[PDB]
Amino acid sequence: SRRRVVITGMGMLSPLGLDVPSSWEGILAGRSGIAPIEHMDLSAYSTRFGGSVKGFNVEEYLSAKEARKLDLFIQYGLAASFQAVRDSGLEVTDANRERIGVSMGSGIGGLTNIENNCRSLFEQGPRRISPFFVPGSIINMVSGFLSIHLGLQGPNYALTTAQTTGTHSIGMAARNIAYGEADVMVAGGSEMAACGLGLGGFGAARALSTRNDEPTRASRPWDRDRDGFVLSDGSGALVLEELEHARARGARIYAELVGFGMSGDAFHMTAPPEDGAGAARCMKNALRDAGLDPRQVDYINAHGTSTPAGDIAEIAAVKSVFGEHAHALSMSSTKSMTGHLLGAAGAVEAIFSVLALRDQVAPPTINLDNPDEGCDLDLVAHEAKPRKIDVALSNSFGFGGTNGTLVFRRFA
Amino acid sequence: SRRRVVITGMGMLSPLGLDVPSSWEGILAGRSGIAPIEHMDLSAYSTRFGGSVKGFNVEEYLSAKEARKLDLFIQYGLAASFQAVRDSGLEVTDANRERIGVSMGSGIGGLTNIENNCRSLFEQGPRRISPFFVPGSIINMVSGFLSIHLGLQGPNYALTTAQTTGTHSIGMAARNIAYGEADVMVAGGSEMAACGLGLGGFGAARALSTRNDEPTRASRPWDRDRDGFVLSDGSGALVLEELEHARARGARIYAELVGFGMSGDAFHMTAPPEDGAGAARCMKNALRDAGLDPRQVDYINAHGTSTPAGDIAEIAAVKSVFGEHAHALSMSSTKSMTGHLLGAAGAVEAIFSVLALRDQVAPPTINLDNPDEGCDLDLVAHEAKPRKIDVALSNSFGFGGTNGTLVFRRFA
Ligand SMILES: CC(C)CNC(=O)c1cc[nH]n1
Numbered sequence: 037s038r039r040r041v042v043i044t045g046m047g048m049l050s051p052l053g054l055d056v057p058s059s060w061e062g063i064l065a066g067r068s069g070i071a072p073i074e075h076m077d078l079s080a081y082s083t084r085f086g087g088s089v090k091g092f093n094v095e096e097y098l099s100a101k102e103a104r105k106l107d108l109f110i111q112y113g114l115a116a117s118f119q120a121v122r123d124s125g126l127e128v129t130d131a132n133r134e135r136i137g138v139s140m141g142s143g144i145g146g147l148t149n150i151e152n153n154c155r156s157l158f159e160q161g162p163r164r165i166s167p168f169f170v171p172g173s174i175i176n177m178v179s180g181f182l183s184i185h186l187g188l189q190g191p192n193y194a195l196t197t198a199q200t201t202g203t204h205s206i207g208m209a210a211r212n213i214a215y216g217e218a219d220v221m222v223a224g225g226s227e228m229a230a231c232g233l234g235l236g237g238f239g240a241a242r243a244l245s246t247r248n249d250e251p252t253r254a255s256r257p258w259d260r261d262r263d264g265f266v267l268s269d270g271s272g273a274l275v276l277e278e279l280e281h282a283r284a285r286g287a288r289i290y291a292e293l294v295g296f297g298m299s300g301d302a303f304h305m306t307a308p309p310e311d312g313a314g315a316a317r318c319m320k321n322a323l324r325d326a327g328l329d330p331r332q333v334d335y336i337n338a339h340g341t342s343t344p345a346g347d348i349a350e351i352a353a354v355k356s357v358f359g360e361h362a363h364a365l366s367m368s369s370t371k372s373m374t375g376h377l378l379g380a381a382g383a384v385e386a387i388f389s390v391l392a393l394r395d396q397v398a399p400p401t402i403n404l405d406n407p408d409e410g411c412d413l414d415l416v417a418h419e420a421k422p423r424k425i426d427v428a429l430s431n432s433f434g435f436g437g438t439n440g441t442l443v444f445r446r447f448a
Numbered sequence: 449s450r451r452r453v454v455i456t457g458m459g460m461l462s463p464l465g466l467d468v469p470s471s472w473e474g475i476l477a478g479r480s481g482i483a484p485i486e487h488m489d490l491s492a493y494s495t496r497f498g499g500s501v502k503g504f505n506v507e508e509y510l511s512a513k514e515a516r517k518l519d520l521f522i523q524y525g526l527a528a529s530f531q532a533v534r535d536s537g538l539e540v541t542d543a544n545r546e547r548i549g550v551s552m553g554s555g556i557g558g559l560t561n562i563e564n565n566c567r568s569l570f571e572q573g574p575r576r577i578s579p580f581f582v583p584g585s586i587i588n589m590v591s592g593f594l595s596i597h598l599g600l601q602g603p604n605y606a607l608t609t610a611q612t613t614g615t616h617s618i619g620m621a622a623r624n625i626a627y628g629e630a631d632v633m634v635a636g637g638s639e640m641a642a643c644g645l646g647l648g649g650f651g652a653a654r655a656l657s658t659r660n661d662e663p664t665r666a667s668r669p670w671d672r673d674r675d676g677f678v679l680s681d682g683s684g685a686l687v688l689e690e691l692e693h694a695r696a697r698g699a700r701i702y703a704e705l706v707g708f709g710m711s712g713d714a715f716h717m718t719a720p721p722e723d724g725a726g727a728a729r730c731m732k733n734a735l736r737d738a739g740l741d742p743r744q745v746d747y748i749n750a751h752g753t754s755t756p757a758g759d760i761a762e763i764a765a766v767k768s769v770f771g772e773h774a775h776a777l778s779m780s781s782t783k784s785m786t787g788h789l790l791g792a793a794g795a796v797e798a799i800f801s802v803l804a805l806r807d808q809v810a811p812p813t814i815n816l817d818n819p820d821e822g823c824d825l826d827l828v829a830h831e832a833k834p835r836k837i838d839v840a841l842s843n844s845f846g847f848g849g850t851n852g853t854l855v856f857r858r859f860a
């Protein structure tokens with residue numbers, strides 16, 4: 037029946053690093069990747085900072101000629117994907133290429149490319165729209181280009197569930213493997229929404245921290261003085277592999293993906309219910325999916341976006357699911373350091389949860405200077421905490437009240 | 449052993465009609481929904497026609513104020529979804545709401561809303577971007593809004609696989625039910641890409657027919673004079689239901705969804721391999737998934753987009769999968785009449801495949817006046833053909849060489 041699914045490769049671009057080891061070092065050091073934005077003039081914007089991928093060189097991966105036609109989210113997705121596949125040691129052959137697929141998603145996709153092509157259309161005319169505009173901007177083309185570059189003939193798709201995308205992409209890819217639709221999936225998310233429409237759109241919703249004077253202090257999940265999320269760019273990709281397939285080739289296994297939960301809040305497009313009932317249903321689904329006692333959960337990588345409503349509803353959900361055990365587990369928001377990578381948030385955070393299992397350390401929630409009312413769990417304030425982690429849970433919640441939970445455990 | 453999945457409700461907005469029965473009356477009458485586009489100045493564009501939804505009244509579904517918050521593609525997906533739920537007679541209760549989910553996707557999503565917000569951003573600056581710009585434009589908001597409106601707490605997601613979206617959405621929803629993760633899913637696709645960036649984008653890629661003098665004859669799949677696809681808008685939704693759940697409430701069952709296939713070409717971004725090998729793999733995968741012999745297929749609803757390369761490669765794939773049986777089955781492109789609904793193409797064509805089973809009639813390929821070299825199958829040229837149909841296949845192929853096949857069978 038269901039096969040087991042393990043993680044054999046990981047790849048990342050984040051505001052903390054151009055790969056997983058560099059990003060993970062920043063996470064354990066409590067380093068902010070948040071800074072005033074340099075690539076554009078934001079003087080008319082109420083938010084002028086975020087998590088950029090600094091010093092990204094697409095020519096470490098792709099020819100300048102190809103990169104020129106690709107939105108940054110595609111470039112970032114491909115880079116993370118290429119890293120994950122190399123990290124896995126997998127050899128794509130005629131014998132296995134039909135069994136290897138990709139599910140790399142995005143919440144927003146090629147908004148920069150769309151904004152630039154809009155400029156061309158309105159300032160000049162449709163004769164100035166790029167012939168590459170559509171395939172260089174649409175969300176499924178991380179999966180599409182990665183399949184073309186590596187010869188992957190397996191299931192090829194893209195999820196778009198806003199800030200849940202990365203979590204759902206990994207969960208559904210794991211289901212593809214579990215049910216025998218594939219033996220290997222490259223799965224994760226990528227995002228680059230840091231153009232005028234992205235910063236302006238989230239700005240127009242009053243969703244973003246306006247702490248321009250101290251950008252590294254802006255993302256402060258569960259802190260009394262939090263005032264909305266920090267917009268960040270990048271990508272995470274994991275190589276997911278059927279367990280017996282991984283054993284057969286002698287793959288290095290990072291961890292086992294044991295649980296995946298999905299749910300809808302069915303409450304509000306942009307706001308969670310105050311009790312976090314949707315997050316609670318999702319986590320319980322994932323825990324049952326994993327065949328676990330909630331007391332087995334040692335570490336939660338929270339969605340923890342630094343929004344007033346979101347942070348407290350997530351505490352509410354965790355308290356509901358874990359009762360007294362909510363006081364024994366460690367929960368942290370790596371968004372304290374990375375900001376909110378939106379569609380990629382769940383992907384980089386799946387990787388941070390797996391590395392919490394490899395290194396037996398809970399990443400910190402930086403900036404948690406004054407926990408808010410009812411935020412009385414172990415939220416790993418300020419500094420990484422070495423502790424026993426056998427089971428780690430990663431939560432993502434998105435616009436539309438779409439929820440995803442991944443459960444990872446150490447593997448023998 | 450998996451659970452069986454049946455279709456109990458369908459909804460649609462197409463260039464042929466504001467519901468399923470009006471659209472299907474057009475399909476079987478050989479009617480075109482293609483006309484010069486009226487909603488904009490297309491003087492600088494090489495294509496000035498497409499398949500618009502004519503006379504759509506969002507206030508039959510939403511308050512004017514809910515509707516102002518949402519891109520047209522979201523309005524269209526909600527319309528089709530509300531039709532399908534209503535058509536199914538399903539009653540959402542506290543007992544079942546956790547078992548009812550939604551997978552409504554889009555290929556390109558909120559291009560019109562992005563265009564309109566770009567105009568404000570460049571004319572007046574970011575203070576003029578709508579607060580609802582992001583949640584009202586993102587592809588998962590059909591799934592999100594439908595779940596909030598109907599109280600659906602089951603799996604909530606959206607696929608974006610370009611022109612394969614509707615096929616994949618329906619196939620993965622069917623997997624959700626087959627493997628016990630939901631009892632009911634609303635699945636399909638919506639698209640409204642007939643704006644400047646849509647006609648501009650595909651036009652820059654020379655992907656579109658430029659037959660501005662005869663818009664109704666532009667979409668001519670397998671015809672020697674074909675010159676690119678016709679851009680169309682609309683939406684398809686199906687209520688997928690676990691068979692025992694459908695029978696227990698006395699649901700009317702249109703057909704059974706017995707097979708789903710996915711594959712990647714891993715070849716080119718916008719053109720198939722000339723042998724259609726990825727499409728051949730995808731169809732074999734869906735037939736193996738259904739436990740069917742190729743000889744059991746009576747009707748194929750082709751991808752059939754009216755592109756020089758795609759039409760011919762789809763013939764090669766069908767000839768390769770079905771050998772001698774390629775000449776017994778009937779295959780037609782309803783895009784001859786509807787044009788290419790992109791992300792919604794596979795959703796409306798799944799509905800047309802189900803109604804081909806219900807009514808025992810292969811819809812025509814209109815405008816097939818001079819079939820091209822090797823286009824010598826039964827392509828149902830010009831006129832609907834009544835015939836035995838026990839098994840219908842629906843193919844969708846999209847940018848990145850992402851392929852999906854659905855297999856439907858008569859339910860007695
Ligand atoms: C609905 C919003 C956009 C995201 N939701 C959360 O932040 C959350 C927290 C607890 N449950 N959902």
Ligand SMILES: CC(C)CNC(=O)c1cc[nH]n1
Binds near residue numbers: 717718758761847
């Ligand atoms: C790969 C493009 C975007 C579409 N694909 C086809 O048209 C096709 C035909 C036979 N096999 N693939």
